[PDB]
Amino acid sequence: HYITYRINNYTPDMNREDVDYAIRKAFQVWSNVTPLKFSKINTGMADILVVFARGAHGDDHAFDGKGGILAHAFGPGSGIGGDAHFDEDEFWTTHSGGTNLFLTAVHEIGHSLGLGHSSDPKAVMFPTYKYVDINTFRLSADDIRGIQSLYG
Numbered sequence: 726h727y728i729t730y731r732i733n734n735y736t737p738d739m740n741r742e743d744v745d746y747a748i749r750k751a752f753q754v755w756s757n758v759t760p761l762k763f764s765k766i767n768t769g770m771a772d773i774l775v776v777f778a779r780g781a782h783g784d785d786h787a788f789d790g791k792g793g794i795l796a797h798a799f800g801p802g803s804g805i806g807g808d809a810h811f812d813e814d815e816f817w818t819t820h821s822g823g824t825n826l827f828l829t830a831v832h833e834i835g836h837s838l839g840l841g842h843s844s845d846p847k848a849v850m851f852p853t854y855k856y857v858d859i860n861t862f863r864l865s866a867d868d869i870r871g872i873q874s875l876y877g
């Protein structure tokens with residue numbers, strides 16, 4: 726129940742502190758509904774690596790340029806397992822005006838922890854990006870069902 730994460734690199738779209746905050750808040754969403762304890766590391770071997778990259782980036786799932794696929798993430802495992810990759814050809818944002826990193830990271834971390842996609846459009850795990858005010862964002866009951874089915 727104790728999972729480490731590291732931010733490999735920072736999108737130039739955002740301030741470094743804003744990337745840190747968005748990612749920290751995204752892990753907090755999942756920690757708030759599970760026994761999971763997440764610890765950020767700055768250097769070293771983490772369970773979950775966060776990476777921004779474009780096109781082909783070393784995993785056999787190349788990105789596709791601006792638009793299309795925004796991000797993907799691997800389920801829990803050794804190596805690339807757990808990692809969450811964000812397509813740098815998107816414009817990552819703290820709020821709107823691009824693709825919101827926090828919301829996207831909530832979705833990807835879901836996959837990092839072993840979740841698939843939901844058929845509930847209110848779930849963060851439903852694979853349609855839609856901006857919502859970050860302060861009013863809430864996991865759906867379907868997301869909570871999924872994650873609690875794995876942890877606890």
Ligand SMILES: COc1ccc(-c2ccc(S(=O)(=O)c3ccccc3CC(=O)NO)cc2)cc1
Nearest residue numbers: 793794795796797828829832849851852853854
């Ligand atoms: C509410 O906040 C949200 C909800 C959903 C996502 C989300 C939605 C879609 C995608 S995507 O990369 O375009 C995509 C679209 C369809 C099928 C697969 C994918 C890849 C994917 O599911 N990555 O996790 C990636 C992230 C992002 C943020």
Ligand SMILES: [Ca+2]
Nearest residue numbers: 790792794812
């Ligand atoms: Ca893309």
Ligand SMILES: [Ca+2]
Nearest residue numbers: 772804806807
């Ligand atoms: Ca990993």
Ligand SMILES: [Ca+2]
Nearest residue numbers: 738813815816
């Ligand atoms: Ca970018």
Ligand SMILES: [Zn+2]
Nearest residue numbers: 782784786810
């Ligand atoms: Zn990748």
Ligand SMILES: [Zn+2]
Nearest residue numbers: 832836842852
């Ligand atoms: Zn997804």
